[PDB]
Design a protein around this ligand. Structure first.
Ligand SMILES: *[C@@]1(=O)[C]N([C][C]([C][C]([C])[C])[N]C(=O)O[C]C2=[C][C]=[C][C]=[C]2)[C][C]1[N]C(=O)[C]([C][C]([C])[C])[N]C(=O)O[C]C1=[C][C]=N[C]=[C]1
Length: 215
């Protein structure tokens, strides 16, 4: 495994989105992971639909919150997820209106990464690619973050409240780090991204609830 990885360069990462006034971060996390497998699978970097997930994933709560695992599971038994086009995002949950002809990807199951192991996570990201993760994002530093390797001592590993997307890792001046994609706009953090501390004892709980779809 390399000492550096960034799937932004290789082309596994689409543009940053905004979830708006809805708790759909678990959707944008699931869609990111799915997108990344696509580019590897069928060379195409398409923008999937976080809204199809919001409305149809009955095991979740939609704008109230949910798990990525449920969202991947749904994409399997329902045999498919659309392109943003066939189900654009309106940040309002609504009655399920999935569309066969829309279909732009599918996944056959999901794998969960060993709870709390950042060594397994670095490997999953080096070998598989973009991985869905959860984190504690209540800290005010997180919202006002602007540059550098993020680390705050009040980040609770047991209070996962936001889902995000890990798309690589590397080291900035002696400080190892996870490269994270957020769904809060490009006007947040560093152009929609944040460098989170790595190896520093499960910072914020980044390796506690991580997964990826199988294609
Ligand atoms: C996110 O949007 C979706 N939700 C997911 C949460 C944990 C996941 C594992 C990450 N699950 C959950 O709450 O489970 C509910 C459930 C489970 C099973 C069945 C039924 C229901 C958490 C949620 N996160 C947020 O909404 C965050 C919270 C931060 C502040 C901690 N807020 C956010 O993104 O704010 C939106 C915003 C608006 C404007 N400008 C910037 C940001």
């Amino acid at each position: 495994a390399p000492d550096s990885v960034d799937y932004r360069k290789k082309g596994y990462v689409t543009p940053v989105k905004n979830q708006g006034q809805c708790g759909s971060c678990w959707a944008f996390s699931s869609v990111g992971a799915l997108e990344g497998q696509l580019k590897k699978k069928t060379g195409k970097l398409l923008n999937l639909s976080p809204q199809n997930l919001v409305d149809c994933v009955s095991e979740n709560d939609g704008c109230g919150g949910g798990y990525m695992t449920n969202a991947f599971q749904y994409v399997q038994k329902n045999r498919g997820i659309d392109s943003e086009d066939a189900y654009p995002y309106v940040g309002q949950e609504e009655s399920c209106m999935y569309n066969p002809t829309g279909k732009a990807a599918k996944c056959r199951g999901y794998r969960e990464i060993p709870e709390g192991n950042e060594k397994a996570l670095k490997r999953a990201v080096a070998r598989v690619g973009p991985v869905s993760v959860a984190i504690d994002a209540s800290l005010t530093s997180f919202q006002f973050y602007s540059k550098g390797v993020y680390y705050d001592e009040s980040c609770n590993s047991d209070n996962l409240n936001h889902a995000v997307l890990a798309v690589g890792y590397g080291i900035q001046k002696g400080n190892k780090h996870w490269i994270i994609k957020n769904s809060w706009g490009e006007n947040w953090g560093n152009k929609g991204y944040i460098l989170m501390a790595r190896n520093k004892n499960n910072a914020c709980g980044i390796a506690n609830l991580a997964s990826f779809p199988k294609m």
